[PDB]
Design a protein around this ligand. Structure first.
Ligand SMILES: [Ca+2]
Ligand code: NA
Lengths: 276, 63
């Protein structure tokens, strides 16, 4: 049987599926460790690998990418799970190796490929503690070109009054996403700071895993694809809206939670964002 | 206990001992400083970011 993971209903994606809005024709690049394209509960439309020794983006030797991609777009059928945007066209943009790490130039090259191939949404479930001129340039150009760009805030918890949001989430051009649980409580690991934009479910999230498996994971990596998927739903109902409009509709319709330093504007609500 | 500020520019082995001699089942991974990594949070994992001198450059942290 097919199960709907709790995070997909918490953001209210089912209300949009009920009017026929499921992401059809919206192109989502998952910039990550690749995606297992032979998964029975996934359809991958294209891709490229930037990782010099792992040239197949359709083989995911880590498991991370495939799990992120199932949150965005696991197929609506009679098996496994269901994505936020289950008719989305998923692109595998492999920038991380089997150990889940990559060089900054591989990440940049991934973003560049996403611009060149006209992606509508980019999801980045990844980060580092330092930025760079080339990385800042590349995300600001994706946004200038029209792309909605979403990234994990980071898993560094609190450190007083200091911000713990990593890059590229820390850039103003990027929607930085933190993690809540099924009770709308911030997860202990979730990064904080003025750069934090919104929250989405990040605790015990079931999704697809390589080799026809399913599995629950935690992290701001799992919260980010909820928002990338939400963007794709909004664009399938309003294909005429810009990235500016999509971002502002999500930020203005959240369920408000705590202090913005810990919760950004609050938990996304895609049903409300899509009625704006 | 979730981070080891105290592990500074200590060597590989000093970090491995302290961390294991504090968190027995640690899955420890050594990676270069200046790389990007996934943002999954795994309670078992402690990633160690080193300079070219095999010394800890950044606060090691569970997850
Ligand atoms: Ca399914
Ligand atoms: Na940001």
């Amino acid at each position: 049987a097919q199960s709907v993971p709790y995070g997909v209903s918490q953001i209210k994606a089912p209300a949009l599926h009920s009017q026929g809005y499921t992401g059809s024709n919206v192109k989502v690049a998952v910039i990550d460790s690749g995606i297992d394209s032979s998964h029975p509960d996934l359809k991958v439309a294209g891709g490229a690998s930037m990782v010099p020794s792992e040239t197949n983006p359709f083989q995911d030797n880590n498991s991370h990418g495939t799990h992120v991609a199932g949150t965005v777009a696991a197929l609506n059928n009679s098996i496994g799970v269901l994505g936020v945007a289950p008719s989305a066209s998923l692109y595998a943009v492999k920038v991380l190796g089997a150990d889940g790490s990559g060089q900054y130039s591989w990440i940049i090259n991934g973003i560049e490929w996403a611009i060149a191939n006209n992606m509508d949404v980019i999801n980045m479930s990844l980060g580092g503690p330092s930025g760079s001129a080339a990385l800042k340039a590349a995300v600001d150009k994706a946004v200038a070109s029209g792309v909605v760009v979403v990234a994990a805030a980071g898993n560094e918890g609190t450190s007083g009054s200091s911000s713990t949001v990593g890059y590229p989430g820390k850039y103003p051009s990027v929607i930085a996403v933190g993690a809540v649980d099924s009770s709308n409580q911030r997860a202990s690991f979730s990064s904080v700071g003025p750069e934090l934009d919104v929250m989405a479910p990040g605790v015990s999230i079931q999704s697809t895993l390589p080799g026809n498996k399913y599995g629950a994971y935690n992290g701001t990596s799992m919260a980010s694809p909820h928002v990338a998927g939400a963007a794709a739903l909004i664009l399938s109902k309003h294909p005429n809206w810009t990235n500016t409009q999509v971002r502002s509709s999500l930020e203005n319709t959240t369920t408000k939670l705590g202090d913005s330093f810990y919760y950004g504007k609050g938990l996304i609500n895609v049903q409300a964002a899509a009625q704006h | 206990k979730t981070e080891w500020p105290e592990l500074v520019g200590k060597s590989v082995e000093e970090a491995k001992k302290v961390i294991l001699q504090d968190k027995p089942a640690a899955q420890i991974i050594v990676l270069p400083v200046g790389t990007i990594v996934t943002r999954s949070y795994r309670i078992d994992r402690v990633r160690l970011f080193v300079d070219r001198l095999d010394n800890i450059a950044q606060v090691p942290r569970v997850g």
